[PDB]
Design a protein around this nucleic acid. Structure first.
Length: 86
DNA sequence: ACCAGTCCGGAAATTT
DNA sequence: AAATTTCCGGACTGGT
């Protein structure tokens, strides 16, 4: 029953993932998918699937925009922002 | 002009 | 029902 946003948060709150995901503003809730295809693979694997990629994961993130859960940081490649404090 | 990559949302299907 | 997953085609951007 895990959601994409909780999954990204766990990846960010756990040491050792800096080569694939990283804060750019911790207080701002702003993070970068440093190795986006790797993050996507890991997200698919969370559901026992081997074929999740950045296109599909990013579509799920875009569905978060209307929900005020996550927004795009405009003009920063692979950077997104949690709206509620992470 | 072409190409490759990022980002967008629409629909539809599927899964929680 | 809600949260995706899947698939896709366009706009925009930078380089060649």
């Amino acid at each position: 029953s895990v959601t994409l946003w909780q999954f990204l948060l766990q990846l960010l709150r756990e040491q050792g993932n800096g080569h694939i995901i990283s804060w750019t503003s911790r207080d701002g809730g702003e993070f970068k998918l440093v190795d986006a295809e790797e993050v996507a693979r890991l997200w698919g694997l969370r559901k026992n699937k081997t074929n999740m990629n950045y296109d599909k994961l990013s579509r799920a993130l875009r569905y978060y925009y209307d929900k005020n859960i996550i927004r795009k940081v405009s003009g920063q490649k692979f950077v997104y922002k949690f709206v509620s404090y992470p």
